[PDB]
C-alpha cells in the first residue's frame, strides 16, 4: 500500500522578514489617481515569514508540510520546475477530496479528486538516453482516486519554459484564499534577476481562478520530482536523487490599509494604517505628506 522512507536527520526551520511585499486590489472595483481605505486580509508591510530549502544530493532532506490557517501567500524562484503541485486534506487519505495541479509544456491540468496519499509522496522523472529527453513514468504517489468532482485542463497560462538555462532569474507570486467555501486563486509574475533575495520594488497580485471548493483544510503539502539515477548493484548509494529548489511562503492577516494610485491607474505606493504612529497619521488626514 504505502512505503515509509524517512530520514532520521532533521533541520530546524529558518525565518526571514518580509521587506515590503504583499499588496493587491481588495476588490475588483477600479479607481484612479485617488486614495481609498479598505479592510481585508492583507500582508503587513513589515512582517516576518519563513523560508524553505529542500535540496538533497552538503546534503539535506527536509520536505515538510505547512498548515493553511486562513489563507496563504506563496512564492518561489524555481527554474527546472522542481515544485509540481500540492494536495490538501485533514487526514491525507481517500476520506477527503483534494486539489491537484500539474503544469507542463502541453497543457495545464487542475484535478480535484480524493487521491490516496502515501507516507512520503514525491514525483519521479526518468531520463531516456535513446530519446535524449527526461519524462515521467513513476506515478506511485497516489494509490487510487475516486469520486471525481472537478477537472480543468487548458494551455500553460504564464509558464514560459523557453530558456534552456535559467539561473534564478524569475519570481512567481500568487495568493490562495479560502472563505465561505470558495478557494479563490491569484496569479502575479514580476521577473527579477538580482544577487539578493528580495527587491525594493512594488507591485500587486491579481486573481487567477475562482474554484469554489467547500471542505475544511488546515494542512497542505507539495510534491517534488525526484529524478532517476542509474546506479550499479555495487554502488549502494543513498538512493535519493533530486534537484535544487526552495519556495517562499508568507501569511495573511485582516487589517486596514491605504493604497495609492497614479495617473496610469496602477498602484505605485501605499502606507499601512497601523504600522507605526507616522503611518497612522497618513491614513488619518488624507495622504502621505504631512507638514510639521
Amino acid at each position: 500500500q504505502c512505503v515509509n522512507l524517512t530520514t532520521r536527520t532533521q533541520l530546524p526551520p529558518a525565518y526571514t522578514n518580509s521587506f515590503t511585499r504583499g499588496v493587491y486590489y481588495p476588490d475588483k472595483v477600479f479607481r484612479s489617481s485617488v486614495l481609498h481605505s479598505t479592510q481585508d486580509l492583507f500582508l503587513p508591510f513589515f512582517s516576518n515569514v519563513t523560508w524553505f530549502h529542500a535540496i538533497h544530493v552538503t546534503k539535506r532532506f527536509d520536505n515538510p508540510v505547512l498548515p493553511f490557517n486562513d489563507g496563504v501567500y506563496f512564492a518561489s524562484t524555481e527554474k527546472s520546475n522542481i515544485i509540481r503541485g500540492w494536495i490538501f486534506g485533514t487526514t491525507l487519505d481517500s476520506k477527503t477530496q483534494s486539489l491537484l495541479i500539474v503544469n507542463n509544456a502541453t497543457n495545464v491540468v487542475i484535478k480535484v479528486c480524493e487521491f490516496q496519499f502515501c507516507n512520503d509522496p514525491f514525483l519521479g522523472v526518468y531520463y531516456h538516453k535513446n530519446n535524449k529527453s527526461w519524462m515521467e513514468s513513476e506515478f506511485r504517489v497516489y494509490s487510487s482516486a475516486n469520486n471525481c468532482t472537478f477537472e480543468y485542463v487548458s494551455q500553460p497560462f504564464l509558464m514560459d519554459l523557453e530558456g534552456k538555462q535559467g539561473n534564478f532569474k524569475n519570481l512567481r507570486e500568487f495568493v490562495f484564499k479560502n472563505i465561505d467555501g470558495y478557494f479563490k486563486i491569484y496569479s502575479k509574475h514580476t521577473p527579477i534577476n538580482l544577487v539578493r533575495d528580495l527587491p525594493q520594488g512594488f507591485s500587486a497580485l491579481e486573481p487567477l481562478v475562482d474554484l469554489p471548493i467547500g471542505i475544511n483544510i488546515t494542512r497542505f503539502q507539495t510534491l517534488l520530482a525526484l529524478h532517476r539515477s542509474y546506479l550499479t548493484p555495487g554502488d549502494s548509494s543513498s538512493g535519493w536523487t533530486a534537484g535544487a529548489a526552495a519556495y517562499y511562503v508568507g501569511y495573511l492577516q485582516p487589517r486596514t490599509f491605504l493604497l495609492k494610485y497614479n495617473e496610469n491607474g496602477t498602484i505605485t505606493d501605499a502606507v499601512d494604517c497601523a504600522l507605526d504612529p507616522l503611518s497612522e497619521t497618513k491614513c488619518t488626514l488624507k495622504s502621505f505628506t504631512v507638514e510639521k
Binding site: 486590489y25 472595483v29 477600479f30 491607474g265 496602477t266
Partner: protein, 49 residues
C-alpha cells in the same frame, strides 16, 4: 488604464463609475448632471409684475 482582472470601478462615494459589458470591455465615469437652483429677483409688487 483598466487592468483586465478588475470588475467594477468606484471613484469615491460608492459611485460605481465603471460599467462594462460581458462581450466588450469599456471603462466609463459617472457624475451627476449640471443642474441648478433658482431665485426670483422681484422689485416691489406694487411697482411692477
Amino acid at each position: 488604464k483598466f487592468l483586465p482582472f478588475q470588475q467594477f470601478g468606484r471613484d469615491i462615494a460608492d459611485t460605481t463609475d465603471a460599467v462594462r459589458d460581458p462581450q466588450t470591455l469599456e471603462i466609463l465615469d459617472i457624475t451627476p448632471c449640471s443642474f441648478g437652483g433658482v431665485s426670483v429677483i422681484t422689485p416691489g409688487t406694487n411697482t411692477s409684475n
